[PDB]
Design a protein around this ligand. Structure first.
Ligand code: TGL
Ligand code: HEA
Ligand code: HEA
Ligand code: PEK
Ligand code: PEK
Ligand code: PEK
Ligand code: PGV
Ligand code: PGV
Ligand code: PGV
Ligand code: DMU
Ligand code: DMU
Ligand code: CHD
Ligand code: CHD
Ligand code: CUA
Ligand code: CU
Ligand code: MG
Ligand code: NA
Ligand code: ZN
Lengths: 79, 227, 98, 58, 259, 46, 43, 84, 514
């Protein structure tokens, strides 16, 4: 719905060679949205865009390490 | 790839690399001119019995050899900067692929739709198949669709490395904890080689990069079969 | 608020420091701290170059603002001329330390 | 305290041909030998350590 | 006999003992970090202290006792000190660069914010502010000491110099307690790294400067300084001001802005 | 002071050209040989 | 520049000797190590 | 700026002493008051094994290799948490 | 007396001599390392069979050539010997501290040789970038001993800088302004200022690497929020000024040699020469990131660094053309020193021009970390510095020793070296353009031809170095004492005889104010 995604589009907020924050921001956004939805009684499907973008941009080991830390309670980012 | 006795750049595979060839031709002409001129004048100053050892005035000829060089530098900078910004232009890719450097091999990840990933190691010289290139072949190549704008994201999981493909005009350092972006676009199908370009220890010389450019349709079946 | 107890150079300076100080007071420069002023440098009015031996290296800045300094040994005896501008210099030897 | 600089000036300007680092007397000589012995000995010891560290102790 | 005012120094063994002590300290640090032994380091630090003591003792002998410091020699020593201080400024600049580089673009590993997640900075209005008033005050008192010396007032020179030193020691003690009380350590990421290495090197400079002042204090007690010739004191004062200014930058950058 | 003049302002002797040849040969030869022996050292440790 | 004749002239024979000795001091040690490179690689 | 005081007719030893005792030391006294007032041990925060903190890539060259140089048991947790 | 003179020295000439001896010895070490590099690359395959050893060899080659050969010779050797003589000063401002700048080098060299002896050496590249240089990829004492070597070499040079700047500012005749000092003296002062400002930043940076390796700091470790790129900035902030530090005293000696053998009383456009060196010095501090065009920097930053870097060609051009204008109309003396200077002018210009090709970030993407860079710096730095050193050495050897060299042998030496270095390095441009990476122990088969020729060229240069040693021996063996020297009126350093007495200028020169 409103998707049909090929890959993460150009984001004017991150126009330079260093894309580290682009990955990080979308990872955060997806998880913040996922928590809002699961909490207030709504659907995680609205959080889809962020999931696709961070999935396309973020290295597997980063996503993996971050997931592990959120589970351990050591994720330094605010979610 | 480079061939025996090559003098200049590998043949341009992308529009940007073509652009650089022309810019290099332009600049190299200038380099030849100035170096030969200097060599010339040296020989000119040394081939005469005529002398003039008294004090010579400088605030006049110094204007010439200050303004001319400045103009020549601007003549180089203009096309240099035009290409630099052109490389930077927003292109909007159809695909995103990531590569992680490791001691000593590269791994690739195509995670736009499916979670596809694999390691890419150099084929040992003893295991090369007849006709294959020593130090250049890898077990798993980087299959990519030709004639499409692709976003390459480069990083590392240990020390620094550098992902390069001379034919496409590419070189982006692989730094741990950082995600470097570059765009790739091959005008032709084929196999394009590159080698790790940042000293990463013992096997820095042995962790090549091999891109395999095929039509989109073949890229898609390859991705499926690679899951 | 105030008082004394701190020695002065006059009372405590010693060695070469003291010599330079006492000489400067008499308006002398035995240790070549100052740049000598030129005479007209003619045959009759040569630049007098003090020395404690029978020769001293002279550096001549022929014209004001020249970056090139002309160097040569000035020997005791008849006045010599700068190889570049011809101005005259004459050595006036010995003494300093009584 | 009293100003005894003049005494020290006399002692160090005394024409005995001794270099400034030994001109204070026998203590200078001792301190010097201690310093130099520690330096030279310590250096020999470092060379030894280098020899030791140069080889693998598996 | 020479007829210029410069100083030809007697052949000295200190440059060699100094160089060797440098080898002993670096070798020692290596032996300590990797081969768990402090023997070399111990000898190194010892010969180093011995070298500095004898070398500067000789400089005092050459100037106060032998009179080799004519105005020309003193002029050169002034340039030497200013240049030395400049090199020290550039050294600190490298650490301030490291601080600003990390703090201005906090990486995801820190939580993408500064200070990092999990770091609770010291309150800059507490001991760090006290430390600031302490160094600023010592800057005033050392200026009083200098004017006293030049006006020929022995008692007040010693009084002002003593106050300056006490303040330097007070700063050092306060900082040492701050180091102990701090909830973060040098191993607490880039925050602890920049904090302790930068303030640490500064702390070392305060200790060096204090020592230099103490040396001037004793030389003053022994009447070495005249109301006009006292370069050792002037250099210690310039060095002390340098230390004071580095603190102001540290305070503003690391303690205040970086909190 | 010290001896002055040609062959006297240097830390080595040039009184005998053959002893000098030996000195120079050891001096420069040791420097040039060092890397070869260090490489040999590193290959022989493992 | 002008100079006086050699106080201790070095004849052509003496020069061949000096040159030879010089070249050998560089070439022999290095050559030895290089020659025995295989003996080192695996031992 | 010009401060808020005045003198300047001749800055000498008396003036700098006036500043030492009339401004500088009193400032140190006030800051000493302020500090030895707002002190008091603040309740140490709950331990969380954050990966960017308590870094250990090589043991320290002292003690058991796991304690920082100026380790304070009360406020400095080890990689595994606060001590006994 | 021997120990007093040579271990406890406070004389600028004797200290200069210790530096020339140290530097010549270091050059032998640096040369052997370079032949080991080229032997490994001499034919396809592996020679050493241990690439960590190859990397350790490349790393040590650079440190030795830079810190132990070039700097000691140019600044400590020629600088100590010539600067006081050229301004009529009795010695350096701090003649005792000067001795410590010297004595810190042998320990520094020992620490470097130690790092290659212990563990598996530091196979990091002379840039020592982490994480490769960190305690995980390079565990053990090696990298730490390397860092300490640099600390001692850094202290030596910083103290030497303070000494030279003070001496040049404070010890000239009362009537001589800074605009009346020789160009070599200017080149040393400017070099000293760059050293003074740049070395402390390196010191800061390598100290941070040391603490990351041993005190659990994470300045360059992403896990603690650090950044490997920060080290690069700190290194290169020192690194670029360093390359200008390596060439400046060379520019100074070249000006003297060219002026001297053109039979001129002065170099053309003195003030333009001063201006050029100062501008090069200034600009040399704002172009460092051109060593980081591939690390992933903003495009605007890259455009700035490309531009700032190109501007250096202007002041550099004024020097080149001024040397040529000094030759113009001269009564040319084809001495061996003049040949080195002329070779310098040409080879330096070639290397400088390829540096301008590299300044373009666009092109650098493809040239970075390839042999094109190695070719660039071996022309400007290797040939440039070595040629200036050889020219100055042959020119001033009679002043330092009191003996003359055999000119014919010296000309033969120049010829062999000229062939050797061009055969060794010219083909490397081809290797770079075609894509061969630097720091490689082996290469794809296509690169075989140029690598073979390059390694052959390296042996030619070895022959030249061995011959140089023989030539120096012959000079000392024959003992042809100097009698007369031309142009002493504009070359003060020669005015006190060959060799000049222990103490020169006990009675200073007389210079009128007018
Ligand atoms: C040693 C190996 C030589 C191999 C030669 C080529 C074989 C070709 C086969 C067959 C040739 C024809 C078929 C292939 C054409 C390929 C065209 C190409 O893609 O084009 C680009 C290529 C090839 O460029 C060329 O088109 C080759 C140019 C060669 C210039 C040589 C000058 C040589 C001088 C002395 C001999 C060399 C050593 C000393 C060099 C001293 C410094 C120059 O790559 C370059 O850019 C290389 C050069 C890099 C920049 C150096 C700049 C300053 C150099 C010299 C100034 C001298 C001035 C005075 C005049 C010269 C005075 C001495
Ligand atoms: C003697 C030392 C020395 C000197 C003087 C220079 C001088 C210059 N260098 Fe070079 N350089 C090095 C030593 C030196 N370099 C080293 C050691 C490295 C590699 C380090 C490493 O990675 O290990 C390097 C690397 C290097 C790089 C990084 C390449 C890379 O890693 O990808 C760049 C980038 O711009 C560069 C540029 C230049 C430029 C523009 C000059 C300019 O200053 C040159 C100017 C001179 C001329 C241009 C010629 C004379 C001028 C004229 C005749 C006038 C007319 C000219 C024009 C109008 C163009 N250098
Ligand atoms: C001053 C700097 C200097 C000098 C002179 C040299 C000289 C030489 N270098 Fe260089 N080299 C570097 C600095 C220098 N190099 C640096 C910085 C690197 C990069 C390291 C890295 O990547 O980390 C490098 C890397 C390097 C490589 C690339 C390695 C790789 O990428 O894997 C190669 C390859 O051929 C090479 C070869 C040589 C050769 C054959 C010589 C010489 O044989 C050429 C001929 C010169 C001489 C033989 C010197 C003679 C001098 C004397 C003996 C002094 C005499 C003294 C008196 C008279 C007082 N060097
Ligand atoms: C545990 C913490 C550690 C503490 C800190 C560590 C180190 C500090 C070290 C030393 C300094 C302390 C005292 C110095 C002691 C004796 C000085 C002796 C000379 C003397 O008594 O000097 C007098 C003034 O000193 C005097 O009041 C002495 C002055 C004391 C000043 C500070 C007291 C403040 C009082 C309250 C005022 C605050 C109000 C603020 C107003 C606004 C400010 C602008 C002037 O006299 P005279 O007749 O002109 O001189 C004849 C020759 N001496
Ligand atoms: C009281 C304030 C004054 C500070 C200095 C006083 C004592 C420490 C000893 C030497 C310090 C000198 C310079 C600083 C070097 C490293 C930073 C040290 C700053 C410091 O002391 O920081 C401490 C760490 O100590 C540590 O590791 C320190 C470990 C001690 C070993 C020192 C390591 C030696 C490395 C020196 C490198 C030398 C290179 C310098 C080159 C100069 C130019 C060439 C902080 O304590 P912590 O427990 O982590 O947190 C406190 C939690 N309650
Ligand atoms: C965010 C960053 C964080 C880190 C910051 C950390 C700290 C901050 C910085 C600084 C503060 C520290 C201390 C300041 C206190 C005292 C310093 C001493 C100055 C002093 O008191 O200087 C006096 C006079 O000024 C003189 O020297 C004037 C003469 C100077 C001579 C030496 C300079 C020579 C060096 C090279 C020359 C430069 C050329 C300029 C032109 C270049 C154009 C590009 C002493 O006299 P003198 O030498 O005989 O000279 C005779 C001239 N009157
Ligand atoms: C000085 C007078 C000349 C004026 C010219 C200007 C030059 C330098 C001063 C400017 C410094 C402040 C600029 C900061 C603003 C940008 C904030 C920022 O964010 O910059 C940061 C680094 O700045 C940093 O440490 C900056 C750290 C400092 C580097 C500059 C080096 C010069 C220092 C030596 C000079 C000696 C002076 C002696 C002192 C008295 C990080 O870099 P980014 O690329 O953003 O990375 C983020 C990515 O995820 C997205 O791409
Ligand atoms: C636990 C403590 C140990 C820590 C290690 C360091 C310890 C102490 C360092 C303190 C430095 C003490 C220096 C004492 C110098 C005494 C000699 C002196 O001060 O000598 C003076 C000259 O100045 C001169 O050389 C000026 C000499 C300048 C020296 C200043 C150098 C500071 C040293 C810093 C070293 C570390 C660098 C930082 C590390 C990262 C003598 O001339 P005057 O004073 O005019 O006398 C003449 C009159 O009497 C005539 O009437
Ligand atoms: C990993 C650990 C690395 C450790 C490396 C340690 C290296 C060496 C350690 C031992 C060195 C200490 C020995 C004392 C040195 C004193 C030098 C000094 O005080 O030198 C003076 C000159 O410098 C002046 O003034 C002003 C300059 C004063 C310089 C003080 C020397 C301090 C040495 C440390 C420098 C660090 C560089 C700082 C930047 C990072 C005096 O000059 P002299 O020629 O002596 O005399 C001239 C006579 O006319 C005097 O009457
Ligand atoms: C550029 C200027 C800087 C030069 C380098 C600075 C030198 C710093 C010296 C640090 O040395 C020390 O090291 C120790 C480690 O060996 C300590 O002992 C300790 O370490 C132990 C050994 O395991 C324990 O037994 C103890 O509890 C104790 O804390 C210790 O007190 C301290 O003196
Ligand atoms: C990069 C710089 C290097 C330049 C190349 C060196 C040029 C050649 C130098 C000659 O050196 C040697 O020659 C040998 C062979 O000709 C060796 O002998 C060896 O080989 C033998 C004969 O094959 C034996 O007689 C002995 O046991 C032996 O060790 C070997 O010792 C060595 O000294
Ligand atoms: C004894 C001497 C007077 C002059 C002289 O020595 O003849 C006096 C005058 C001022 C000095 C003192 C100053 O008043 C400052 C200090 C104040 C005291 O609380 C402790 C000692 C103190 C550190 C000093 C000790 C004292 O012995 C000094 C050195
Ligand atoms: C004014 C100054 C010194 C002149 C003197 O006092 O002798 C001279 C020295 C070198 C000159 C510079 C150099 O000749 C290089 C440039 C040449 C151009 O003709 C003018 C600007 C230019 C940048 C010059 C400006 C100015 O005339 C300079 C800077
Ligand atoms: Cu990976 Cu080089
Ligand atoms: Cu550079
Ligand atoms: Mg690179
Ligand atoms: Na090889
Ligand atoms: Zn004249």
């Amino acid at each position: 719905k409103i998707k049909n995604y090929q890959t993460a589009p150009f984001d004017s907020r991150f126009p330079n060679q260093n894309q580290t924050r682009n990955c990080w921001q979308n990872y955060l956004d997806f998880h913040r949205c996922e928590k809002a939805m699961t909490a207030k009684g709504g659907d995680v499907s609205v959080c889809e865009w962020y999931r696709r973008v961070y999935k396309s941009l973020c290295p597997i080991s980063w996503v993996s390490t971050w997931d592990d830390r959120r589970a351990e309670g050591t994720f330094p980012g605010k979610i | 790839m480079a061939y025996p006795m090559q003098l200049g750049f590998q043949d341009a595979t992308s529009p940007i690399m073509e652009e650089l060839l022309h810019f290099h031709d332009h600049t190299l002409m200038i380099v030849f001119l100035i170096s030969s001129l200097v060599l010339y004048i040296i020989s000119l100053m040394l081939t005469t019995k005529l002398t003039h050892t008294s004090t010579m005035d400088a605030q006049e000829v110094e204007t010439i050899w200050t303004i001319l060089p400045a103009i020549i530098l601007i003549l180089i900078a203009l096309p240099s900067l035009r290409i630099l910004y052109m490389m930077d232009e927003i292109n909007n890719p159809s695909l995103t692929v990531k590569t992680m450097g490791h001691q000593w091999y590269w791994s690739y990840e195509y995670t736009d739709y499916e979670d596809l990933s694999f390691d890419s190691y150099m084929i040992p010289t003893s295991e090369l198949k007849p006709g294959e290139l020593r130090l250049l072949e890898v077990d798993n190549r980087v299959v990519l669709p030709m004639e499409m704008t692709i976003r390459m994201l480069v990083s590392s999981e240990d020390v620094l490395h550098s992902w390069a493909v001379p034919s496409l005009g590419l070189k982006t350092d692989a730094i741990p904890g950082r995600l470097n972006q570059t765009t790739l676009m091959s005008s032709r199908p084929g196999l394009y080689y590159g080698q790790c370009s940042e000293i990463c220890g013992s096997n820095h010389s042995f962790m090549p990069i091999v891109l395999e450019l095929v039509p989109l349709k073949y890229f898609e079946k390859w991705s499926a079969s690679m899951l | 608020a105030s008082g004394g107890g701190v020695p002065t150079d006059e009372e405590q300076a010693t060695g070469l420091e003291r010599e330079v100080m006492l000489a400067a007071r008499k308006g002398q420069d035995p240790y070549n701290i100052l740049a000598p002023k030129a005479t007209s440098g003619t045959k009759e009015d040569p630049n007098l170059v003090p020395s404690i031996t029978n020769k001293r290296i002279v550096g001549c800045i022929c014209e004001e603002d020249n970056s090139t300094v002309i160097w040569f040994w000035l020997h005791k005896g008849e006045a010599q001329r700068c190889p570049s501008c011809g101005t005259h210099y004459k050595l006036v030897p010995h003494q300093l330390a009584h | 305290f009293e100003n005894r600089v003049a005494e020290k000036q006399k002692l160090f300007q005394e024409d005995n041909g001794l270099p400034v680092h030994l001109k204070g007397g026998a203590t200078d000589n001792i301190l010097y030998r201690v310093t130099m012995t520690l330096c030279l000995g310590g250096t020999l010891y470092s060379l030894y350590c280098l020899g030791w560290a140069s080889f693998p102790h598996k | 006999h020479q007829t210029h005012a410069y100083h030809m120094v007697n052949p000295s063994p200190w440059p060699l003992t100094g160089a060797l002590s440098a080898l002993l300290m670096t070798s020692g640090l290596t032996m300590w970090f990797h081969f768990n032994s402090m023997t070399l380091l111990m000898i190194g630090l010892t010969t180093n202290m011995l070298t500095m003591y004898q070398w500067w003792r000789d400089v005092i002998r050459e100037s106060t006792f032998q009179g080799h410091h004519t105005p020309a020699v003193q002029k050169g020593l002034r340039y030497g000190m200013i240049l030395f201080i400049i090199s020290e400024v550039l050294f600190f600049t490298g650490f301030f660069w490291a601080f600003y580089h990390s703090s201005l673009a906090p990486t995801p590993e820190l939580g993408g914010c500064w200070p990092p997640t999990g770091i609770h900075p010291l309150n800059p209005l507490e001991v760090p502010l006290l430390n600031t008033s302490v160094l600023l005050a010592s800057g005033v008192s050392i200026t009083w000491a200098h004017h006293s010396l030049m006006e020929g007032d022995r008692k007040h020179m010693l009084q002002a110099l003593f106050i300056t030193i006490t303040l330097g020691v007070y700063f050092t003690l306060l900082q040492a307690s701050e180091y102990y009380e701090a909830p973060f350590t040098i191993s607490d990421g880039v925050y602890g790294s920049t904090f302790f290495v930068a303030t640490g090197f500064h702390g070392l400079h305060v200790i060096i400067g204090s020592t230099f002042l103490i040396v001037c204090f004793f030389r003053q007690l022994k009447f070495h300084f005249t109301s006009n010739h006292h370069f050792g004191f002037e250099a210690a004062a310039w060095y002390w001001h340098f230390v004071d200014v580095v603190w102001l930058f540290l305070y503003v950058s690391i303690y205040w802005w970086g909190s | 002071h010290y001896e002055e003049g040609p062959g006297k302002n240097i830390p080595f002797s040039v009184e005998n050209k053959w002893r000098l040849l030996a000195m120079m040969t050891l001096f420069f030869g040791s420097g040039f040989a060092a890397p070869f022996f260090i490489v040999r050292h590193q290959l022989l440790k493992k | 520049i002008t100079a006086k004749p050699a106080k201790t002239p070095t004849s052509p024979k003496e020069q061949a000797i000096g040159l030879s000795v010089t070249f050998l001091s560089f070439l022999l040690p290095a050559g030895w190590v290089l020659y025995h490179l295989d003996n080192y690689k695996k031992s | 700026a010009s401060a808020a005081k005045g003198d300047h007719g001749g800055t000498g030893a008396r003036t700098w002493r006036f500043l030492t005792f009339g401004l500088a030391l009193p400032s140190v006294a006030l800051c000493t008051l302020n500090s030895w007032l707002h002190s008091g041990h603040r309740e140490r925060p709950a331990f969380i094994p954050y990966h960017h903190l308590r870094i250990r890539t090589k043991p320290f060259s002292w003690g058991d290799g796991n304690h920082t140089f100026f380790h304070n048991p009360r406020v400095n947790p080890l990689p595994t948490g606060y001590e006994k | 007396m021997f120990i007093n003179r040579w271990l406890f020295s406070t004389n600028h000439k004797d200290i200069g001599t210790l530096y020339l001896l140290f530097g010549a010895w270091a050059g032998m070490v640096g040369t052997a390392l370079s032949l080991l590099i080229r032997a490994e690359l001499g034919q396809p395959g592996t020679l050493l069979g241990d690439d960590q050893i190859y990397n350790v060899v490349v790393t040590a080659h650079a440190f030795v050539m830079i810190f132990f050969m070039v700097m000691p010779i140019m600044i400590g050797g020629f600088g100590n010997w010539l600067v006081p003589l050229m301004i009529g000063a009795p010695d350096m401002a701090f003649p005792r501290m000067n001795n410590m700048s010297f004595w810190l080098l042998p320990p520094s060299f020992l620490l470097l040789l130690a790092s290659s002896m212990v563990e598996a050496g530091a196979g990091t590249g002379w840039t020592v970038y982490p994480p490769l240089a960190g305690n995980l990829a390079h565990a053990g004492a090696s990298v730490d001993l390397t860092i300490f070597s640099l600390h001692l070499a850094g202290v030596s040079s910083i103290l030497g800088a303070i000494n030279f700047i003070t001496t040049i500012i404070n010890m000239k005749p009362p009537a001589m302004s800074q605009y009346q000092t020789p160009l070599f003296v200017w080149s040393v002062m400017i070099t000293a200022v760059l050293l003074l400002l740049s070395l402390p930043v390196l010191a800061a940076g390598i100290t941070m690497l040391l603490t990351d390796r041993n005190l659990n700091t994470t300045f360059f470790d992403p896990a603690g929020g650090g950044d490997p790129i920060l080290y690069q900035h700190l290194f290169w902030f020192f690194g670029h000024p360093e390359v200008y530090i390596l060439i400046l005293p060379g520019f100074g000696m070249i000006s003297h040699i060219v002026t001297y053998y053109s039979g001129k009383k002065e170099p053309f456009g003195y003030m333009g020469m001063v201006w050029a060196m100062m501008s090069i010095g200034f600009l040399g501090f704002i172009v460092w990131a051109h060593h980081m065009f591939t690390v992933g920097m903003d495009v605007d930053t890259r455009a700035y660094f490309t531009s700032a870097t190109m501007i250096i060609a202007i002041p550099t051009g004024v020097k080149v053309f001024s040397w040529l204008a000094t030759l113009h109309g001269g009564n040319i003396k084809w001495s061996p020193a003049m040949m080195w200077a002329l070779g310098f002018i040409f080879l330096f210009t070639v290397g400088g021009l390829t540096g301008i090709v590299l300044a373009n970030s666009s092109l650098d993407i493809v040239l970075h970390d390839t042999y094109y860079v190695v070719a660039h710096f071996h022309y400007v730095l290797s040939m440039g510095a070595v040629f200036a050193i050889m020219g100055g050495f042959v020119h001033w050897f009679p002043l330092f020793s009191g003996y003359t060299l055999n000119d014919t042998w010296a000309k033969i030496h120049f010829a062999i070296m000229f062939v050797g270095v061009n055969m060794t390095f010219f083909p490397q441009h081809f290797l770079g353009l075609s894509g061969m990476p630097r720091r490689y122990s082996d290469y794809p088969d296509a690169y075989t031809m140029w690598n073979t020729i390059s390694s052959m060229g390296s042996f030619i240069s070895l022959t030249a170095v061995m011959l140089m040693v023989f030539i120096i021996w012959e000079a000392f063996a024959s003992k042809r004492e100097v009698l007369t020297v031309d142009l002493t009126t504009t070359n003060l350093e020669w005015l006190n005889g060959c060799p000049p007495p222990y103490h020169t200028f006990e009675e200073p020169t007389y210079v009128n104010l007018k």
